[PDB]
Design a binder for this molecule. Structure first.
Ligand SMILES: N[C@@H](Cc1c[nH]c2ccccc12)C(=O)O
Length: 333
């Protein structure tokens, strides 16, 4: 039972990525009944992003984040997409059996087209580059290259797996059945983490809390959460500030219940914010020490990534030779 996930290397992870993705995934990859695959989608980074060191810095920070949070490379095959040349070969092969209409309907592309039309732009493809048009095929290669059974994705990403199933089927039928049809994996128990202003925490919203900061900075961050004008003795209900959902994401059911009655008995916001930052700090204190260790010694991350690549390519090449033979690429004998 092979479980496979791609993560972007396009920025530095925040608390929201920790609660909603990283922390659940690290726990979930400990199941001995699954084989665990996680890669950095660094070649997806050049689809749109362009800053010189953005990919390299986000790669180092995303790799250090997952490591610092307990991702075990002895358990998880952990690698950069840019260290698997087989994926790029597979990407061309799948391109040859993918219908253009499938890419016409890819959501990211439909959004670029509608945004031109929302902006009075009568050319639907204005500004569209082929990375945006074709990345669903590369994502399919990322998955099929290792014949993943389950691909843990958000709701947002469900189309992308359904597209891989579509391409896998068409390859299987045109050539031969080499690709298992991958399956979405969704956990309806991960609460997405709210930001400082009530909305879901997201880099594009400017409502994020950094994941890797010292206590005093984590405190100053927490002190920006929207509160209300209730008095240090006034009854505070939990639905009144995002602070409560923040405290909740870092506390047992019992502690949050205690926090509720604490608020209900008239805990001031300054103390509440103070307690929330401490919970966050307490959960993160050790991880933050490992993150600083790794980011200060990146060659340790590079070693781990090379060992991952070595493991990944061995299984990539086993499948690719089958695929190469199925599409007619064969030695002269
Ligand atoms: N496209 C995904 C990341 C990703 C790339 N390739 C993948 C393959 C499998 C799962 C996820 C991925 C995202 O935007 O977050």
């Amino acid at each position: 039972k092979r479980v496979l996930t791609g993560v972007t290397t396009t920025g530095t992870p925040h608390l929201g990525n920790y609660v909603g993705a990283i922390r659940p995934a690290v726990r979930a990859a400990q199941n001995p009944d699954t084989e665990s695959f996680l890669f950095l989608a660094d070649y997806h980074g050049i689809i749109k992003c362009h800053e010189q060191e953005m990919i390299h810095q986000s790669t180092q920070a995303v790799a250090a984040t997952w490591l610092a949070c307990g991702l075990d490379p002895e358990r998880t095959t952990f690698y950069r997409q840019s260290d698997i040349p087989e994926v790029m070969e597979l990407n061309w092969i799948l391109t040859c059996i993918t219908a253009k209409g499938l890419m016409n309907r890819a959501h990211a592309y439909k959004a670029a087209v509608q945004a031109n039309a929302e902006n009075g732009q009568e050319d639907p493809d204005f500004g569209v580059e082929m990375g945006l048009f074709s990345y669903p095929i590369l994502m399919t290669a990322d998955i099929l290259m290792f014949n993943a059974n389950e691909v843990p994705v958000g709701r947002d990403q469900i189309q992308h797996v359904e597209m891989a199933r579509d391409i896998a089927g068409r390859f299987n039928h045109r050539f031969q059945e080499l690709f298992t049809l991958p399956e979405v994996k969704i956990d309806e128990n991960v609460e997405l983490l709210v930001g400082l202003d009530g909305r879901k925490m997201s880099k594009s919203y400017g409502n994020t809390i950094p994941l890797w900061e010292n206590d005093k900075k984590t405190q100053k961050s927490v002190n920006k959460i929207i509160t209300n004008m209730k008095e240090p003795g006034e009854p505070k209900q939990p639905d009144e500030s995002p602070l409560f959902e923040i405290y909740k994401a870092f506390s047992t059911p019992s502690e949050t219940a205690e926090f509720t009655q604490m608020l209900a008995d008239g805990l001031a916001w300054g103390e509440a914010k103070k307690l929330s930052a401490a919970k966050i700090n307490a959960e993160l204190a050790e991880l933050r020490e490992r993150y600083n260790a790794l980011t200060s010694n990146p060659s340790q991350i590079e070693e781990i990534l090379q060992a991952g690549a070595q493991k990944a390519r061995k299984e990539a090449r086993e499948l690719l030779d089958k695929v190469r033979d199925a599409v007619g690429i064969r030695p002269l004998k």
